[PDB]
């Protein structure tokens with residue numbers, strides 16, 4: 001297989017870390033299609049994140065990015081982010097995009113079109129309402145769940161419903177993204193980014209950065225528990241989504257990020273450490289999750305164990321407590 005494709009996989013393992021292995025394990029035509037999609041989304045995110053590119057330039061770039069996929073020489077050299085290689089060596093990635101079957105090209109192209117429009121819209125603003133929080137996550141994450149679902153169906157490995165049920169696919173992306181947002185509070189803080197919805201945090205403090213002050217920790221934990229309770233509402237769709245899948249490799253691919261984020265939410269729940277640094281799950285814990293998350297009954301047992309754990313930790317003085325109890329009861333039945 002081509003020097004071109006060999007270099008895509010090198011980029012995959014350089015950026016994707018532990019996740020590259022899951023992708024290289026996908027059956028058939030799926031492997032290359034997801035690998036290229038992953039790198040293309042990496043390029044788009046990198047442009048979005050790069051604070052050293054002006055809005056005035058950034059906007060047409062996000063808007064037109066779906067087009068660059070068809071332009072053999074397009075590359076971008078003016079970026080200062082960690083993953084700049086994918087942008088600098090874009091023609092290699094876009095060459096291999098253009099080799100995919102047309103049915104996979106047109107999925108990827110359409111998703112990037114719609115993501116770029118969306119990402120441009122939030123260059124300006126902060127996330128104000130819970131409803132805006134969902135719209136932001138749709139653009140940066142729910143759309144990737146939809147795109148991947150359409151590759152699975154178009155390849156004929158999964159039923160057409162998987163490709164068409166956009167609400168369930170969207171929830172796959174929103175659960176992961178909200179979990180990252182919740183866990184990355186301090187890192188984003190320090191980096192000058194603000195993604196927690198104002199409508200929620202403003203019930204507690206005058207400014208988002210106040211949660212990092214030691215006198216605010218009781219209010220910080222309460223807000224945290226409230227956002228965690230928000231994210232839990234996606235779990236029923238997650239279980240429905242995973243339950244429809246039939247290809248083993250696609251199942252492992254989808255199930256694994258989802259159990260890691262369940263474990264992450266459980267570690268974060270009522271946890272003051274979120275506001276003091278980076279709560280991560282242990283490597284041994286993560287490896288076992290990866291090994292065990294390979295069939296619905298296992299994945300369902302994991303979900304249930306971690307929810308029981310959150311359940312028994314719910315304090316009665318917490319303002320979200322009965323909402324938390326409620327969604328966990330739903331999940332459980």
Ligand SMILES: COc1cccc([C@H]2O[C@H](CC(=O)N[C@@H](CC(=O)O)C(=O)O)C(=O)N(CC(C)(C)C)c3ccc(Cl)cc32)c1OC
Pocket residue numbers: 015016017018019034037038041140141142144145146148149169172173174176177180253254255257
């Ligand atoms: C049906 O939908 C999916 C099914 C399987 C996996 C993912 C999703 O999983 C990783 C998992 C991953 O990338 N693991 C990281 C750990 C981490 O970054 O927190 C890693 O091991 O590097 C992830 O995080 N995102 C990034 C977004 C969630 C923003 C879309 C992502 C980016 C590109 C692709 Cl092709 C896929 C995903 C799905 O997307 C919803």
